[PDB]
Amino acid sequence: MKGYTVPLSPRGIANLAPAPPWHYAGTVVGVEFFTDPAAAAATLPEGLTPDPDSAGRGVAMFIDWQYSSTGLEYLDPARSQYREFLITLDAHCNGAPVAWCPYIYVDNDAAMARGWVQGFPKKLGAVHQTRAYSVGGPGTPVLGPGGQFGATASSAGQRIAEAKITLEQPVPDPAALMSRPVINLRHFPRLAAGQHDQPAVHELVMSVLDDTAVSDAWVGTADLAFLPAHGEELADLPVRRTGKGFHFDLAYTVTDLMTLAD
Amino acid sequence: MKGYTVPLSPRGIANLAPAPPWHYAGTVVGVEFFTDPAAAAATLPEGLTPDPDSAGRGVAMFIDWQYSSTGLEYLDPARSQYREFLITLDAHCNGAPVAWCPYIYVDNDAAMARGWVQGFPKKLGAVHQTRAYSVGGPGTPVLGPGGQFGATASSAGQRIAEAKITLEQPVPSRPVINLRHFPRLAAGQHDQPAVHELVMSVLDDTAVSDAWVGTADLAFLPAHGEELADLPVRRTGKGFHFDLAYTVTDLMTL
Amino acid sequence: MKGYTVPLSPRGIANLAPAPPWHYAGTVVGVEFFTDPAAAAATLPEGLTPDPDSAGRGVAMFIDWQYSSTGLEYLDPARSQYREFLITLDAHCNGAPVAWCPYIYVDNDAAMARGWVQGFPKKLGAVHQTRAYSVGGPGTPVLGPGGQFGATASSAGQRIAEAKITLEQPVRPVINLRHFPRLAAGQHDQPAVHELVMSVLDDTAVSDAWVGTADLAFLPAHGEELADLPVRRTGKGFHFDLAYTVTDLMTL
Amino acid sequence: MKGYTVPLSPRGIANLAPAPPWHYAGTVVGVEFFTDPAAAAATLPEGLTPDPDSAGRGVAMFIDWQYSSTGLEYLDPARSQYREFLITLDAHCNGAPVAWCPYIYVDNDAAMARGWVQGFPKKLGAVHQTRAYSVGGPGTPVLGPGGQFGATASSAGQRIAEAKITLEQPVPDPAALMSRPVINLRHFPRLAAGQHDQPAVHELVMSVLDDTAVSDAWVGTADLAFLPAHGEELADLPVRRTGKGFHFDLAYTVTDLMTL
């Protein structure tokens, strides 16, 4: 019996995800937004407190991801490619600025399992973003000034977010993007009678990213809407105002995860 | 912060699955099969032992499920309905006959989450079974003698099982064993899972109706990223068809 | 070069659908509804007129279908099973009551192709209906008084219909438009096929029919016009099994 | 009643696809292959002739497409983006080299409709290709020498093609890529009793492309197999050997179609 996630198996192949390292290359459409600070605060776990400066601020990101591990798994895009929609919300952890992730959607079961392991609360969703093609022409925007990109996310056949950005200029400090560490919650419940309120795993974690790299980063304007949907609570973070729109490539590797609190 | 599974949330609605009770109603197309005893034994967790009498026996099941909880969730079929393929293998637990589940596939993320909590090692797949309709006619088999039912399962766009049964007669006890498993990602701990425990599936208010038995054809197909077909079908036993209903509120840690 | 629909092929296997007969067995969750007569009339093809008595009335149906042809194709549910949401609207054809189908969605490409040949204007979508299981219990409604069924339809990741019925009590030809455009420059407004047809169903059977109360809404969606037939009020909800065979189609 | 394809409608929005122009931008992973001449011949419509020089040769392509029309439809990727797998086979049309398309798969119903109108015989399938990311790192190949790219296609949950290419050098003559015009067959049957063998539309066509452009074109080595599947005949064109592998961006516009 071998393997990292379930199913464990004789050969350690069938598992949804193998052990790290997990490598990621992706292209991000992001939108800075502002919701009601109290609504942001309602989503925070114990151990996180409202950002004293930017309470209500969040980032919405629509990402086209390609995953690999140690054996050119990206040559199997049927399993290794996926698309992702998440939000983070500004908060503080012990007087430090962080980014809390309450909701996140992917179109891939391997990504869902990897996410749970990291404490990303992934559900399945349908996620799309406009692509820029080098060849150019009327089927594509320019990755440059004036370039317009749309992005959407649905869950269980219901549209939950729609965005558009228009690029204006290159990001001045690419390395500054996502300067806030991301905070998640590893959580795995018990089913034994009498223990449904006593999870086996329940711990705040900080995301740890190795060898992080950003390229081709642009900033501009943005439009964003969250839409009410049965069985979802995203739209309970209403978009009162949109800030900057962002487009960039992102790469990193996962090998670790920092447990803060159990 | 409220909720049973992630995402936890202010209202406890966003979670993939709320707390039990979980209620199920389903229709099963199933195939008794026999593989190499040694290949079956290779899949067994430490706490289980080969069945002294029927080592190599297993059961393949394709199920059209409908789930609900305490609020008529079955009125939301886009979430509550799912289709499932699983196999179990005969084994023993302390001299008592049980059914070990090594592989199982569903087409619903809520089901996948509920599964993991029960220790069912669910992955996503595409599962289908022939349905019987009471109106009858050339678009449907009869649910009765001569009725033919097909079923298939795929994962990541690859077919892994194909089956057919032919019903012959109406029908005139092995608990399922699973492994709750949740790994750690902290460096140095990737071999030290936070949850790793053998469990027995506990089912409340179980009911079976409309059970038929007959013949069966079955194949497992090799697929990248899967090991189901490492359990070759040397032969089939009975095919079977029935409705099944039960409620989950509990789980026994072994 | 064999086959009925594309792709044509050396063996006539690859086609999306072979020649009729096409057999169907299904379970229908449906809602009678009423929209604005003008909105319904705006969808009518040349050759159909408003119904003088029930203009505005329509029927919404969510169906779990199983198809087969001459070779027990229902043993291949990955191709043969599908789910369908459609509406019809009351109208007249030369003075006779008919049911015009403006919009229909299915979750299967074989079904789309069969539909197109019949003149059902199918697009892909995600369609779901509550199922009644004979075993009973808390995971299923019970067919009969008080049995509740939900149903939904989405298109391109957008919800476009939501419905619920409550059963209480036991218990018009469809007109379509075969339409295939031309792409030759100068001919984009001159379709190669454009003909009003009446649906012809062989050996039709209905069973275990119930009626009761209903709720129904069509939701606005980008790229869709269903919700431009707003539900002003609902009539009967209904539930039944349906079977028929298709071998023919009547050109009008 | 407005619209181009069905459904026709009061505003001409609901239709699967509106009238042309249809614009395309995509990234192609391609494999030159060789099957049995007689197998290729078997798929040919009346009107086409085996190629006297390269009978049995074809090209398999996996493409990540983005479509748009006159209103920035590419801002709605849920509808406008799709993935496509097709093969063409070398043939002749009246002494001239062409490329016959027998089978093609897409993961989008609007593409299926546009395809049928063009005579592309589209079915639904699931198609994927490895992508190159500019940022680089262990999650991506390099778009350059040594870059490896995989690709797969499935139909109805069955795998029907798997491919990998390894790039070596720039395509010497990008303009010449797929210089063979594609031949298709517009086909629409009748359902009236007695007419099931008398289709309403049945005509050989040549694909017409406007403003075609290619960029970032690379060539290298390739591996490819077609797999037997129920209800498919692709694998009846068995890959006996592979030739070149190709990677390039492709863009064009569709406004016309030539009936042969």
UniProtKB/TrEMBL annotation, chain C:
GO terms for molecular function: lyase activity. InterPro entries: Acetoacetate_decarboxylase, ADC_dom_sf. Pfam families: ADC. It comes from the Bacteria. Pyruvate binds at residues 24, 114, 118, 122. This is Acetoacetate decarboxylase.
UniProtKB/TrEMBL annotation, chain D:
It holds the Pfam family ADC. It comes from the Bacteria. One of its GO terms (molecular function) is lyase activity. SUPFAM superfamilies: Acetoacetate decarboxylase-like. Pyruvate binds at residues 24, 114, 118, 122. This is Acetoacetate decarboxylase. It comes from Streptomyces bingchenggensis (strain BCW-1).
